[PDB]
């Protein structure tokens, strides 16, 4: 009822506080409806050269000196971004009512399995059919350019763009998304959850709040809730195939170690 709406609004405020680049801002940028200088477009090797110092990268040497292979430099940029995204999602998850009262080991398991699915949900907010916003909206990397990278790296983003076209077709907003992501985090079917019932209650509660939010915010979109629920399983498949590709990279390309946070997340995952 009224309390469910209050919960939705609390989560939306926490979402705005936790995630600096929202879907609203991203769309403003993607549609050219902002006063800001339009993003630098990386559509090819030369545009990547120029644009490259715009990529949000902090390390021993500048991104240009990390590898002679351009695809490997894109790999390191994406890894750095994903680490910061995991930090962001962790802060949001702690803001979710009831989350900090679960057994800490359950919080860790839920975050582990949930965070990639949440990353792919929010990545769609930064995408259109032609490419993806990077570096807090200061850059735009084309889908074609990503597809032109040598194997294995060439197939990394295509399932994400394909997912994103359908997901964006749902025309969700940030208020919808805050609850959707909270729902994904509190999945009770994650392997190894020790104490399931409190998680199941919170996820149940979030699902009623989500239902009410979509009924109020999208009155003419019939069975939108069902469509959105069906998207979570898709996200799981995306994660599975992504992990297989990552395993290829580990077994194939010389010294391809990952950041310890991502290594921790993928280790013994499923």
């Amino acid at each position: 009822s009224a309390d469910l709406r209050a919960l939705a609004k609390h989560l939306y405020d926490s979402y705005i506080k936790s995630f600096p680049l929202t879907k609203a801002k991203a769309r403003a940028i993607l549609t050219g409806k902002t006063t800001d200088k339009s993003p630098f477009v990386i559509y090819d090797m030369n545009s990547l050269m120029m644009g490259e110092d715009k990529i949000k990268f902090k390390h021993i040497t500048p991104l240009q000196e990390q590898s002679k292979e351009v695809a490997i430099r894109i790999f390191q940029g994406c890894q750095f971004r994903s680490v910061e995204a995991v930090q962001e999602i962790t802060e949001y998850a702690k803001s979710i009512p009831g989350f900090v009262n679960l057994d800490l080991n359950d919080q860790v398991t839920l975050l582990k399995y949930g965070v990639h699915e949440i990353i792919y949900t929010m990545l769609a907010s930064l995408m259109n059919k032609d490419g993806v916003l990077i570096s807090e909206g200061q850059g735009f990397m084309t889908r074609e350019f990503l597809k032109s990278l040598r194997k294995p790296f060439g197939d990394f983003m295509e399932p994400k763009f394909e997912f994103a076209v359908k997901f964006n077709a749902l025309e969700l907003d940030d208020s919808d998304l805050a609850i959707f992501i909270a729902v994904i985090i509190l999945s009770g079917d994650r392997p190894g959850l020790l104490n399931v019932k409190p998680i199941e209650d919170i996820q149940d509660n979030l699902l009623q709040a989500l239902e009410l939010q979509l009924k109020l915010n999208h009155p003419e979109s019939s069975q939108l809730f069902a469509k959105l629920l069906q998207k979570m399983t898709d996200l799981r498949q995306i994660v599975t195939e992504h992990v297989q590709l990552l395993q290829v990279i580990k077994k194939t390309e010389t010294d391809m170690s990952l950041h310890p946070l991502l290594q921790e997340i993928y280790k013994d995952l499923y």
Binding site: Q87, T90, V108, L111, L261, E264, I265, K267
Partner: peptide, 11 residues
Amino acid sequence: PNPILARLLRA
């Protein structure tokens, strides 16, 4: 395991 996630969760 997962010391880094547990530390990220303990602020």
